[PDB]
Amino acid sequence: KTTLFCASDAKAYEKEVHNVWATHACVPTDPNPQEMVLANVTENFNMWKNDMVEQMHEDIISLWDESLKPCVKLTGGSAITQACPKVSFDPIPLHYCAPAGFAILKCNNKTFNGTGPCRNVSTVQCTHGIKPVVSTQLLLNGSLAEEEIIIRSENLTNNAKTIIVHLNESVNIVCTRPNNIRQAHCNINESKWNNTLQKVGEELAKHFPSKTIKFEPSSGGDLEITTHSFNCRGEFFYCNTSDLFNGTYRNGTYNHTGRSSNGTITLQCKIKQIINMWQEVGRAIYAPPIEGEITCNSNITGLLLLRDDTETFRPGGGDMRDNWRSELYKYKVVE
Ligand SMILES: N=C(N)NC[C@H]1Cc2cc(CN3CCC[C@@H]3CO)ccc2[C@@H]1NC(=O)C(=O)Nc1ccc(Cl)c(F)c1
Ligand SMILES: *[C@@H]1O[C@H](CO)[C@@H](O)[C@H](O)[C@H]1NC(C)=O
Ligand SMILES: *[C@@H]1O[C@H](CO)[C@@H](O)[C@H](O)[C@H]1NC(C)=O
Ligand SMILES: *[C@@H]1O[C@H](CO)[C@@H](O)[C@H](O)[C@H]1NC(C)=O
Ligand SMILES: *[C@@H]1O[C@H](CO)[C@@H](O)[C@H](O)[C@H]1NC(C)=O
Ligand SMILES: *[C@@H]1O[C@H](CO)[C@@H](O)[C@H](O)[C@H]1NC(C)=O
Ligand SMILES: *[C@@H]1O[C@H](CO)[C@@H](O)[C@H](O)[C@H]1NC(C)=O
Ligand SMILES: *[C@@H]1O[C@H](CO)[C@@H](O)[C@H](O)[C@H]1NC(C)=O
Ligand SMILES: *[C@@H]1O[C@H](CO)[C@@H](O)[C@H](O)[C@H]1NC(C)=O
Ligand SMILES: *[C@@H]1O[C@H](CO)[C@@H](O)[C@H](O)[C@H]1NC(C)=O
């Protein structure tokens, strides 16, 4: 294809690392939105095979090695040591733009499952704003679906193909390490989670009909995928999800099997210093946690599930490109 560029709304005076990187690598956004309609054009898309995702992945990796430097980095046999200062870290939206001679096509089917032919298409200079939010299991601070829940997969038969659940209805998750210096928790409205998993099981049933739907905690792996992991304000949170991906859906009803309390699920989390890298196969060691109350109040906007009568799904992730895919699913670059 071609090298795209990034337009951000970032601020040169911000110390925050996303802002620095973007002012150093992205052009300013166009306030005037260049957009063409053309319903009839009938392009095909395949979110699973989309050079845009690669380019963004590249960039985010660059941004992380520039901003979130680890005290140590073990890759292969080598151990590189850098200064690993604490930093101001809040992901900002990024727009991916097509350079002169190329344009981005945008699929407008509010229910597009991200592969195949798309009726209502548009021409755009740039993607919407996308926050590069690295995480497993739970997709955070993404952009909602429009009409109903969508279920995206390269191939649902193949149970080794990550499944992306695109929710239409954000679900609050609040994580705090309050003022063991490494212990924190996450709170979720069990009624909200309730509804969401029930609705998700419905939609999942449409794709496996004679089967009862099951949600079970992550079976095994590196700690970074068997828990909901993510970076908040700098530190690396790992949160246990077993009280969350824990329920059955049978006969149009969803029962939650995980344990709650006064109608909220709380997740035990630990802040980890040693970190299995998502960028490449290796480890990164970071300084002990900063002090004071570390809190991220985020929207669960999507899931990352893997499947194994009864059909049962567990939370997955680990290929940070799936996060990008979940937002970029609806575009392709052309010409
Ligand atoms: N150091 C290794 N090994 N990097 C390999 C990556 C690549 C991959 C891929 C799969 C997918 N599976 C299924 C089929 C193929 C593969 C086999 O497992 C799972 C995990 C992983 C690994 N991702 C992570 O390690 C990771 O994301 N850490 C992490 C760190 C910080 C934060 Cl905030 C976070 F959110 C996460
Ligand atoms: C996705 O939708 C296309 C049609 O738009 C269909 O051919 C394909 O089988 C669907 N796959 C999944 C996993 O929904
Ligand atoms: C979201 O999707 C679900 C199931 O796909 C549906 O029941 C609901 O009405 C949709 N819209 C919402 C919840 O606003
Ligand atoms: C998914 O994989 C199965 C084998 O696991 C294969 O038979 C099937 O054709 C694949 N689906 C698609 C849409 O290619
Ligand atoms: C999550 O909690 C359950 C029970 O509390 C435990 O068996 C499981 O190993 C925990 N996983 C992690 C990664 O802490
Ligand atoms: C669901 O949660 C309960 C306690 O909250 C736990 O005993 C049970 O094992 C969990 N289910 C699974 C499949 O882990
Ligand atoms: C949030 O949770 C409380 C109890 O945990 C419940 O009373 C309230 O209705 C929930 N919010 C919504 C919008 O349902
Ligand atoms: C929804 O949550 C409420 C309170 O948190 C609980 O009483 C109810 O059993 C839940 N609904 C389902 C279908 O599990
Ligand atoms: C999600 O967005 C809110 C608002 O920008 C922010 O407070 C929170 O830290 C974000 N969460 C993550 C994981 O970036
Ligand atoms: C969560 O979703 C709401 C509604 O979609 C949105 O207005 C808000 O910016 C999002 N972020 C937080 C932290 O609530």
Could you tell me which CATH number the domain at 5-334 has? 2.170.40.20
Resolution stated for this PDB structure, in Å:
2.8
Backbone φ, ψ for residue 326 (5° rounding)? -55, -30
Task: Pick the residue whose CA is nearest to atom 36 on ligand 1.
Answer: 224
Q: Report CA-CA distances (Å) from 158 to 14, 161, 162.
A: 45, 6, 9
What are 281's two structure tokens? 């196969």
Residue 84 CA to ligand 10 center (angstroms) comes to 32
Residue 138 CA to ligand 1 center (angstroms) comes to 14
Closest CA to 75 of 324, 302, 281, 318: 281
* Residue 149 CB–ligand 3 contact under 6 Å: yes
**Which of 157, 163, 207 best tests ligand 4's pocket when mutated (most atoms within 8 Å of CB)?**
157
**Which of 169, 190, 191 best tests ligand 7's pocket when mutated (most atoms within 8 Å of CB)?**
191
d(CA 315, CA 197): 12
- Amino acid (1-letter code) at residue 16: E
Residue 258 CA to ligand 6 center (angstroms) comes to 6
Instruction: Please say whether the dihedral angle defined by the alpha carbons of residues 57, 62, 68 and 74, taken in this order, is positive or negative.
Output: positive
Which ligand is the nearest neighbour of the Cα of 252? 8
- The residue behind tokens 């970071």 is 286
**Residue 239 and residue 175 in contact, taking contact as beta carbons nearer than 8 Å:** yes
The domain spans of the chain are 5-334
